[PDB]
Amino acid sequence: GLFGAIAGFIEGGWTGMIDGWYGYHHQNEQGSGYAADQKSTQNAIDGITNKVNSVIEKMNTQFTAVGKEFNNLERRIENLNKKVDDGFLDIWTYNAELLVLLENERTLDFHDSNVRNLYEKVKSQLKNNAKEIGNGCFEFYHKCDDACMESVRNGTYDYPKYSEESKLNREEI
């Protein structure tokens, strides 16, 4: 992971999560579960969709191309013609393969990067109210519930509304 998240500080995938590519895990006393992130996932969806389509548009589909015949006094021009056929075939084969190599790296990067963005966007919301407990996990300095879990995934978690509670909790360390 060029962005250190995937196959990095967040070691694993969640075969549990099946909603989408990026998501949170939560365990409030009320219970556990998975909830994939709409905004990010839909973005990644949209983008990567655009990426495949953009690459494919650059490929005009091939029209009728049948080979040419030549008689035995036309060896030079039959060879010229093979040179062209082989020359273009090398170029398209090289372009196709090289593109797919390079762009596969970019795509995986993209996903790694989106994940890091997510994490850090949460981290900048919580701060004191929770601590970095490793592998993309926060631990709440205060008690929180399922409806509250939806404030996080909302991008609207109210840091003041629990800053009091978390303060006197954190300060017992």
Partner: protein, 51 residues
């Protein structure tokens, strides 16, 4: 055969809308671009890490 295609090759007909094909350089109709490749798979998802 009594059979319909938008793309014919000396080996047989292709019925696909992928950009590339490695069946034959000789084509009639609207076909994918011939290439020498054996595999052309583009990632869309992410690295699959089940453990």
């Amino acid at each position: 055969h009594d059979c319909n295609t938008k793309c014919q090759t000396p080996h047989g007909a292709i019925n696909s809308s992928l950009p590339f094909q490695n069946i034959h350089p000789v084509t009639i109709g609207e076909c994918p671009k011939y290439v020498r490749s054996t595999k052309l798979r583009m990632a869309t998802g992410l690295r699959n890490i089940p453990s």
